[PDB]
């Protein structure tokens, strides 16, 4: 049961890191495009 | 026991990815601000 609870919590952690990576990808893409346009 | 050891190691991996995401967030923010200031 502790292991099940650990995996559950770790899945939440993973989802948070996915959110973060998606945010950063959009932001760096926006910067790359800004520099290209300039 | 193998599963416990796997979860332990995976938690270390997750912590490393969190470190990396935090580094990248600060770096892209620094770049965004640099461009704004310029």
């Amino acid at each position: 049961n502790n292991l099940l609870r650990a995996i559950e919590a770790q899945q939440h952690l993973l989802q948070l890191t996915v959110w973060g990576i998606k945010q950063l990808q959009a932001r760096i893409l926006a910067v790359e495009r800004y520099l290209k346009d300039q | 026991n193998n599963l416990l050891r796997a979860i332990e190691a995976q938690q270390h991996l997750l912590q490393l990815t969190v470190w990396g995401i935090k580094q990248l967030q600060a770096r892209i923010l620094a770049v965004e601000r640099y461009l704004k200031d310029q």
Binding site: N2, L3, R5, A6, A9, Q10, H12, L13, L16, W19, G20 | L4, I7, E8, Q11, L14, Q15, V18, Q25
Partner: peptide
């Protein structure tokens, strides 16, 4: 949605602390 980087930090830390406890309790 409502997610901000400070909230992200908070939630990461809370889940990490819980997992540490769960893994340790299992050590026992």
């Amino acid at each position: 949605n409502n997610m901000t980087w400070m909230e992200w930090d908070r939630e990461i830390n809370n889940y990490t602390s819980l997992i540490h406890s769960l893994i340790e309790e299992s050590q026992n």
